[PDB]
Design a protein around this ligand. Structure first.
Ligand SMILES: CCCCCCCCOCCOCCOCCOCCOCCO
Ligand SMILES: CCCCCCCCOCCOCCOCCOCCOCCO
Length: 772
């Protein structure tokens, strides 16, 4: 619909870059094709497709409309066969925005290499949860989104922290607009498990080994969250929602030009949610604010400054799971799903805020440069108190453990990169070169010396959280931890033939961890990157990649000799086929992958059964482990009103001995989510449902009162979701979500400190959205 335009005649390149900007649309185009071509003047209020055909008059070019993207091409009478993976330069460095796309499949994406590429072009497993998916299914935070992510298993630590698995591993890499955060441990990463979705366009998850742009981090995956950006036309909405257990949410999102010319633009969002829960005496208030402003210093240089903020604030938090597995005498414990071992006053409140600036420049090259500046705070305030141990006892009494952690982490980042195309042996390739620097500083206080507390409670079966609050006494410990990451990376994408694209690059990395432990250094570590994509027909391509990552170990992962273990590394080997249909409106992939891990910290039983060095009382051993598995997924349009996203993943991970590890992540999983928009008489009704299935999962846990190990099993289970929206009016709509339709009662944790958490019972959410 109609937009304000001002692009005067220039290099086709600038014109195109300037166009994507002015129109809020990603423009893809081939450097060698637009070289030495000229745009025609365009001036004023016009629809974006009249505008672009006017712009290209003279140039001999054609436009392919594809949702939030246009690709531009210049056909010849010649053409000796087609280069589907031709080097394309893009106008939006983070890829195609998903908001308003109507789709559950993404557009282009730079998650793997910083190069803007399509899921077909990307030689790695890349799953995206798109803005619309989030809207239809009510996914309001990162916990909701992960639960709907193909290939991801979400399990509980406690009411205020979950765990995310891919391919054998706990995910511990998070980025924001492509900037890695520091996530070493939970001090550094307060609120990462809790980010509200209000401020994001999409969440994009790279599976495998992602050292190339994460730098130091875990195996499994990266989770990359893209912030919502401001726009050239005014728009926004208000949303109010109401669900099971006194769950009320509201949300305001406003976007547009702040000056008559359009050269300064803004976007602002606020969202507030106060909820109780099926679990007894647990409530949680969350608040978020976000502001970003964009300044055009001139048509090819943009300055962006922004801030965001989220406060997660519960009552009735627990330390570890919702209740203890065994009682005092060693019998399995059996409780209601409402049972909550946390105390009334108990809280794991977690906060986060960012201030950021970026500057981005288009070189008259076709090259583009970008500087990214970040100040992040991850903070927490955690007076935890919760029933813990082998309780109840024969007389129905129980004991509380109560400790208090408060603290803050402040992080600063610089990220700078150059991206452009270049000719080598008569053909067009592209390159990213970039360097990065991060400094983050965790500080905190711990309280465990309680003064004159009586931690028994007389009644377990009817626990209510209604116990007194202790005197924390004086700080037991002072934390001070500084991490410093310096990175340098270079990926090159060579168009070798019309069907074959070769990827060659890597990162060089320097990582120093400093503070109250002995210094942990790693100078000059190289992380390689090898990939190739071979096109088979207009539909299918095959691909292969070899990818790496490592994480220098926590300071207490030492050995026999009191030496820190060499860093936990892994390599992903992946071969696959990916298929693209309806001009990129539908994507399919089947992959086979293998993860080789080396130096995975293992216990060391023989030593630990009777230590011989008081400096390490619990030494480890650095071992090896293997993931073998395969994954299939599909997303996009199955038919005109009909969208899906679905996947299927199979895995087993062992260590070189042979034992199955991460046995709680299931060996087989399946997700399918779908909605359908009726046409004709019912064209204002959208209907939707979904299912998630997973196979057996187990833990080995020690029954201390009976001095024997036990196996705990969660039998495979289905969860079914349902959904309907009705657009009553141009500007107002009403929705309902029903989750866990058949009220399946299942577990999300067994064995985490000898405890258990139930997943959500059936729940509903009502809401109205109002678009101005
Ligand atoms: C040192 C920290 C920097 C803080 C940066 C925070 C940025 C906050 O800015 C708020 C911007 O909100 C823009 C909202 O856009 C509203 C668009 O409508 C404009 C009014 O409409 C004009 C008449 O239709
Ligand atoms: C353990 C028990 C769980 C409860 C299960 C109940 C499931 C019942 O599902 C029925 C849902 O249908 C209700 C239809 O209500 C209409 C929605 O209208 C929205 C109003 O919008 C306001 C506009 O301003």
């Amino acid at each position: 619909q109609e937009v304000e335009f001002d692009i005067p005649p220039q290099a086709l390149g600038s014109a195109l870059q300037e166009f994507g900007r002015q129109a809020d649309i990603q423009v893809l185009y081939r450097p060698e094709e637009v070289r030495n071509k000229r745009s025609s003047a365009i001036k004023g209020k016009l629809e974006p497709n009249q505008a672009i055909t006017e712009l290209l008059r003279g140039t001999g070019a054609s436009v392919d409309f594809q949702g939030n993207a246009i690709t531009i091409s210049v056909a010849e009478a010649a053409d000796s066969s087609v280069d589907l993976g031709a080097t394309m330069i893009t106008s939006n460095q983070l890829g195609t925005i998903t908001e308003d796309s109507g789709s559950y499949t993404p557009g282009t994406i730079a998650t793997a290499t910083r190069l803007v590429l399509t899921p077909r072009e990307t030689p790695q497993s890349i799953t995206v949860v798109t803005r619309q998916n989030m809207d239809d299914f009510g996914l309001n935070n990162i916990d909701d989104v992960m639960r709907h992510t193909p290939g991801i298993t979400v399990s509980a630590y406690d009411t205020d922290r979950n765990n995310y698995y891919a391919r054998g591993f706990s995910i511990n890499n998070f980025q924001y607009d492509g900037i890695p955060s520091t996530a070493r441990n939970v001090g550094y990463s307060a609120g990462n498990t809790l980010s509200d979705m209000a401020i994001y366009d999409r969440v994009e998850v790279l599976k495998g080994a992602t050292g190339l742009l994460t730098g130091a981090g875990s195996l499994g995956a990266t989770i990359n969250l893209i912030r919502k950006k401001p726009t050239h036309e005014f728009k926004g909405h208000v949303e109010l929602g109401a669900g099971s257990w006194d769950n009320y949410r509201s949300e305001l999102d406003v976007s547009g030009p702040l000056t008559e010319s359009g050269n300064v633009r803004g976007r602002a969002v606020a969202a507030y949610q106060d909820k109780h829960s099926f679990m007894d005496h647990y409530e949680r208030k969350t608040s978020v604010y976000y502001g970003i402003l964009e300044f055009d210093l001139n048509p090819d240089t943009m300055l962006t400054v922004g801030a965001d903020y989220q406060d997660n604030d519960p009552k009735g938090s627990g330390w570890s799971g919702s209740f203890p597995l065994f009682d005092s005498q060693g019998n399995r414990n059996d409780v209601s799903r409402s049972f909550n071992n946390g105390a009334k006053w108990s809280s794991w409140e977690q906060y986060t805020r960012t201030v950021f600036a970026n500057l981005e420049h288009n070189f008259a090259n076709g090259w583009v440069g970008k500087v990214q500046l970040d100040h992040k705070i991850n903070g927490y305030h955690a007076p935890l108190g919760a029933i813990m141990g082998d309780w109840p006892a024969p007389d129905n009494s129980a004991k509380i453990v109560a400790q208090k952690y408060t603290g803050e982490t402040k992080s600063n980042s610089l990220d700078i990169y150059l991206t452009g195309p270049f000719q080598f042996l008569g053909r067009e390739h592209e390159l990213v070169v970039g360097t990065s620097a991060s400094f983050s500083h965790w500080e905190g206080k711990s309280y465990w010396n309680l003064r004159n507390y009586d931690n028994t409670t007389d009644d377990f079966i009817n626990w209510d959280g209604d116990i007194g609050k202790p005197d924390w006494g004086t700080p037991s410990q002072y934390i001070d931890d500084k991490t410093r990451q310096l990175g340098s990376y270079m990926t090159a994408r060579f168009n070798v033939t019309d069907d074959l694209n070769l990827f060659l690059g890597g990162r060089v990395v320097d990582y120093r961890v400093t503070g109250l432990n002995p210094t942990i250094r790693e100078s000059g570590r190289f992380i390689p990157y090898v990939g190739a994509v071979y096109d088979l027909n207009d539909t299918y391509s095959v691909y292969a990649s070899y990818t790496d990552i490592f994480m220098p170990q926590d300071s207490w992962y030492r050995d026999s000799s009191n030496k820190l273990l060499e860093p936990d590394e892994g390599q992903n080997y992946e071969i696959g086929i990916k298929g693209e249909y309806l001009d990129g409106r539908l994507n399919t992939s089947l992959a086979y992958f293998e993860i080789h891990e080396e130096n995975r910290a293992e216990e060391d039983a023989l030593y630990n059964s009777k230590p011989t060095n008081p400096a390490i009382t619990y030494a480890y051993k650095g071992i090896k482990a293997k993931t073998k598995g395969y994954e299939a997924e599909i997303s996009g349009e199955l038919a005109p009103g009909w969208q899906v996203q679905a996947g299927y993943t199979h895995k087993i991970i062992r260590d070189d001995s042979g034992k199955k590890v991460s046995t709680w992540e299931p060996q087989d999983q399946l997700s399918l989510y779908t909605s359908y928009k009726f046409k004709g008489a019912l064209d204002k009704l959208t209907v939707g449902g979904g299912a998630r299935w997973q196979g057996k999962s187990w833990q080995m846990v020690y029954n201390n009162p009976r001095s024997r190990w036990e196996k705990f099993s969660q039998e495979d289970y289905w969860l079914v979701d349902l959904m309907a929206r009705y657009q009553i009016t141009d500007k107002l709509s009403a929705s309902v979500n029903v989750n866990n339709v058949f009220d399946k009662t299942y577990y999300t944790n067994i064995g985490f400190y000898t405890s258990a958490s139930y997943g959500d019972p059936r729940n509903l959410m009502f809401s109205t959205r109002w678009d101005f």
